[PDB]
UniProtKB/Swiss-Prot annotation, chains A, B:
Organism: Homo sapiens
Official protein name in the record: Vimentin
PTM: One of the most prominent phosphoproteins in various cells of mesenchymal origin. Phosphorylation is enhanced during cell division, at which time vimentin filaments are significantly reorganized. Phosphorylation by PKN1 inhibits the formation of filaments. Phosphorylated by STK33. Phosphorylated on tyrosine residues by SRMS.
Subcellular location(s) of the protein: Cytoplasm; Cytoplasm, Cytoskeleton; Nucleus matrix; Cell membrane
Domains: entry comment: The central alpha-helical coiled-coil IF rod domain mediates elementary homodimerization.
Associated disorder: Cataract 30, multiple types: An opacification of the crystalline lens of the eye that frequently results in visual impairment or blindness. Opacities vary in morphology, are often confined to a portion of the lens, and may be static or progressive. In general, the more posteriorly located and dense an opacity, the greater the impact on visual function.
Tissue expr: Highly expressed in fibroblasts, some expression in T- and B-lymphocytes, and little or no expression in Burkitt's lymphoma cell lines. Expressed in many hormone-independent mammary carcinoma cell lines.
The encoding gene: VIM
Chain positions found as Phosphotyrosine: 16
Chain intervals for the UniProt region annotation (Coil 1A): 1-30
Modified residues (N6-succinyllysine): 19, 28
Cross-link Glycyl lysine isopeptide (Lys-Gly) (interchain with G-Cter in SUMO2) per UniProt, renumbered positions: 3, 19, 28
Function field: Vimentins are class-III intermediate filaments found in various non-epithelial cells, especially mesenchymal cells. Vimentin is attached to the nucleus, endoplasmic reticulum, and mitochondria, either laterally or terminally. Plays a role in cell directional movement, orientation, cell sheet organization and Golgi complex polarization at the cell migration front. Protects SCRIB from proteasomal degradation and facilitates its localization to intermediate filaments in a cell contact-mediated manner. Involved with LARP6 in the stabilization of type I collagen mRNAs for CO1A1 and CO1A2.
Protein family per UniProt: Belongs to the intermediate filament family.
């Protein structure tokens, strides 16, 4: 059923974006630390 | 079209997956470098 399936991909897309945000922030923090060292 | 809207859907899903993959790989190298310092 393409209502539950297209709400599923949505949830996967959402989780992937949260992951992207988290990782972008951490890599920026790590780079800043390296810059400071 | 429905076929030319589903393809787009699969392409953004792939791009998003790749972004996560690269961010994690970049993150692991940054952690390793900070670790040396």
């Amino acid at each position: 059923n393409e209502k539950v399936e297209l709400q599923e991909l949505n949830d996967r897309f959402a989780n992937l974006i949260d992951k992207v945000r988290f990782l972008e922030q951490q890599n920026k923090i790590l780079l800043a630390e390296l810059e400071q060292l």
